[PDB]
Amino acid sequence: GKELLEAARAGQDDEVAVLMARGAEVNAADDVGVTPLHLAAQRGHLAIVSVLLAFGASVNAADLWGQTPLHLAATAGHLEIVEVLLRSGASVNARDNIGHTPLHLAAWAGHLEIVEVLLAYGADVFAQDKFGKTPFDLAIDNGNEDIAEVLQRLLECRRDAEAAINYQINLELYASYVYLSMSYYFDRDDVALKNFAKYFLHQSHEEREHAEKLMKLQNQRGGEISLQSISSPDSDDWESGLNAMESALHLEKAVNASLLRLHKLATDCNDPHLCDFIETHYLNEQVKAIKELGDHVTNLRKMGAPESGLAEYLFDKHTLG
Amino acid sequence: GKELLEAARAGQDDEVAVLMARGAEVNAADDVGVTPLHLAAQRGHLAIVSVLLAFGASVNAADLWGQTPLHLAATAGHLEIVEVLLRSGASVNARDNIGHTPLHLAAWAGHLEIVEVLLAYGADVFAQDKFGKTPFDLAIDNGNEDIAEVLQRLLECRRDAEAAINYQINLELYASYVYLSMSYYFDRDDVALKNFAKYFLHQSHEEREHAEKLMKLQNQRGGEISLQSISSPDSDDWESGLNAMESALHLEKAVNASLLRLHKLATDCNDPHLCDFIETHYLNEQVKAIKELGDHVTNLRKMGAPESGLAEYLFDKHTLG
Amino acid sequence: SKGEELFTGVVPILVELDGDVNGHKFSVRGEGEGDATNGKLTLKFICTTGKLPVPWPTLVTTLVQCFSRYPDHMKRHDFFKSAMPEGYVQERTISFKDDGTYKTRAEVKFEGDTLVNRIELKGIDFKEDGNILGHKLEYNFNSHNVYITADKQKNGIKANFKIRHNVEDGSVQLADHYQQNTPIGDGPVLLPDNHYLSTQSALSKDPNEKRDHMVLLEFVTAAGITHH
Hints:
The structure is cut from a larger assembly and holds 2 copies of chain A and 1 copy of chain C. In chain A, 64% of the residues lie in helices and 0% in strands. Chain A has helices spanning 4-9, 13-21, 36-42, 46-54, 69-76, 79-86, 102-109, 112-120, 135-140, 145-185, 194-221, 241-268, 272-281, 283-303, 312-318. Chain A is rod-shaped and about 100 Å long. Chain C contains 2 helices and 11 strands. Chain C has helices at residues 56-61, 79-82, and strands at 11-21, 24-35, 40-46, 88-95, 101-108, 115-124, 144-151, 156-166, 172-183, 195-204, 213-223. The longest helix of chain C has 6 residues, at 56-61. At the B-C interface, helix 7 of B face strand 3, strand 10 and strand 11 of C.
C-alpha cells in the first residue's frame, strides 16, 4: 500500500519486484503526490521504472508541484529512462507551474543527448515559460554552449524558410503584374493582335493562383505572411511579339531559379513536407512553361519575325487561336 | 572450331581477334563446358571478353559445374570485367550447385569494390546457399572485415525500417481507439452533444484506414507484420468539448512526430520509395488535421467555453453540423 | 619463400586410386583443376572398372588439402605449402562405426606442373549385406572440419576428423579419420600449431555420360588463430 515507495527510493529493485508480484498499489499517490515512478526517475533506476510501467503505471502523473517523471528524468541526466518514457507515451510538452517543459530543463542542466532525443520526439524550440524565456535563453545564461548552438541552428532554419516563402510570394505577384502589362500592350490599335493579348491575360491570372497557393501554405505552417511593395514592369513598350515572348521566357527562368534555391534551403534544414510541396506543385509547371515558350520563340524566329508582318499575324491566327 | 579457346586461355588477344574475324565458333561448348568467355574471365583479359561479347557470346553460360563468367570474374578480382559483364546482361542472382551467388564469392574473396558494384546492380544481402550461409557469414568466417561492415549496415537498415513500420501501425490503431472512446463520451445523456460524437466517430474510422495502408505497404515490401497489444485510452471522462479537442490536437502532433522520425530513418538508409510514400500519403494530411483542430480550439476558446453553455451548444450546431 | 609460390595460379589435377575391398579391385581416375588462392577445387571422377559395390559418397572423403585457402595471417602455419615441389606423403586410416575399416596410403607431389596423386587402398572387415556399403546411404554431403596438429616426432603433422554420412532413413554413420602427413625432404617445413579447417562440397552428374561418373566442386579453407 505504501511500503513500496521507500524501496523504490533506495533502489531496491528486487524488493519492489517481489512486493509488486504480490498485489500492491502501483499508482500510489503519496504525502506530497510523489508516485514511485517519480522517485524511480529522480534516481537512475531503469529496472524499477520498467517493472513499474509493465505493472500499469501512469507516465503523466501530475505532481503537487506540476512535475512528471519526464521532467525529473530530463533534469537528472539519465538517457535510458528518458527513452523508455518517451516510448511509453510521455508528453514532451507538459508544463510546470513556472511553465517549464522538459526541453527547458534539458537545456538548463546541459544534457546534449537528452536534448537530441527530446527534439526528435516533437519538443518545440521556441516555447516560453511564465517569465518569458525559451530553452535557448536558459542555455545561454548558464554557459551550456552546444545546446545553444544546436538550438540556434533550428531557430535560424525556421526563420530563413519563412523569409524565402515571403520572397516567393512577392516574386509571383510581380510576374503576374508583368504579364498584365504585356497583355494590354497587344490591345493598342497600333498593335492589333488579339490572341497574344488573351494568351498573356491567361498567364497573368495563373500567376496569381500560384501566389495564393504559397500564402495558404504559409498559413498552414504557422508562419507570418508579410506582404510588400510590387515593382512596376521594366517596360511599357514591348517592341513586338517575339521580344515579348523572349521576355516571358527569361522571367519564367528567373522564377524557376528562385524555386530551386528555396528547395535546396528546405533540403538543408530537413523539411520533407516543404520539399514535397515544391516539387509537386511548382517544379513540373516551370519545365512545361519553359518548353512551350521556347517552342513559340523558335517558331516565330523561323517564320521570319519580327521583320515580317504576316508572320506574327499568322502565328496569332494559327498557334494562339 | 576449337583452336580459339587455347588462345583465349594464353591471353592471345590478337590471335583470337584474327581467328574470330574469320568465321569461328563463338559459343563453343568444350570438353567440360568451359566457353572461351569463362576462361577469358578467369584470367584478367578485358580485350578478349570485349571482342567476344561483340561477336555474340552468351553472358549466362551454364557450366557443367554451374558457374557463369560472372562467378569466376567476381571470384578472381578483376573489376573491369565485372562491369562490362553487368552492363551486358549478366544475372547477379545466378546459383552454383552449392547455391553461391556472385556476392557470396565477392565476400569470400575479399573484393570491396566488386561488392559495391554488385550491390548497385541488385544483389541481395540475405541470400543463402544450400548450407545456410549468407554473404555476411562467408565474410566474418574469413577475416574479411569491411565487407562485413558494409553488409551489416544494410541488414540493419532493413531491420530498422521493418520495426518502425510496425510501430507506426500500432500507433495508428491506438489513435483510432482513442477517438472511439472520445466519440462515445459525447453520447451519454449528461453530455448531450451529437455532432461532437459524429465528428470523433469519423476520425476513428479514418485512422483505421491509415493503418491498413501501412499494412499493405509492408506486405508489398516483403516484410513481416507483427501486431501487438493496443493500450486503452488514458481517460474515460473527457471533461468537455474544449478539452477533448485539445487532447485530439496533442495526439495528432505525436503521430506527426513519429512520421517525421520514420522519414528521416528512410532517408538515412537510401530508400526513395518509402520516403515518397510517407510524404505523399501522410505528411499533408497531418498538416491539415493540425490546422483544423487548432482552428476549432481557438473558436471554442473565443466563444467562451468551457465555462459557458450556449458556447458548445452553438459550436456543435453551427460548425460541426 | 618457395613453398608458397608453387600455387600462384590454376593447377590441373590427375588423381589415381587403386583399391582392394573384400575381393573388389577398383581403379579410379579423377580429372579437374584447383586454385589455392580461393581454396577452390573442381573435379570429376570416373571408374573404368564397371559398376562398383561401395556407394560414391564413400569414395568422396578418400580422394589435396594443398589447395585450401590460407590467409596472410596463417602464412606461418601452412605445413602443406613449405614442401613444394618437395611434396609429401600421408597415411590415412578411416574407421566406420558399425562396419570395418580402410587403410590408405597416398603420395602427393608436383609432376612438372600437373598435380598427380597416387593412392593405394586396402579396405576390409565389412559385412557385405550391410548398409554403409550395401547402397542404403543417401547421395548427399555436409559441411565438415579437420583438426591438424603439429607432430615433431615426424616433423610433420597429424590430421584427425569425423565425418557424418546421413542414411536415407535419418540415421547417420560416423567415420573417424586419422592420417599422418610427412614431407619427403629433410628441409625446413613451416610448423602449424593445432587448428581447424572447414570444408564444403557438392556432388552432381553429367547428363550425357554413360559410364559411372561423379562430378564434385568444393571449397576448403582453414582457421584457428584469433589474430589481430
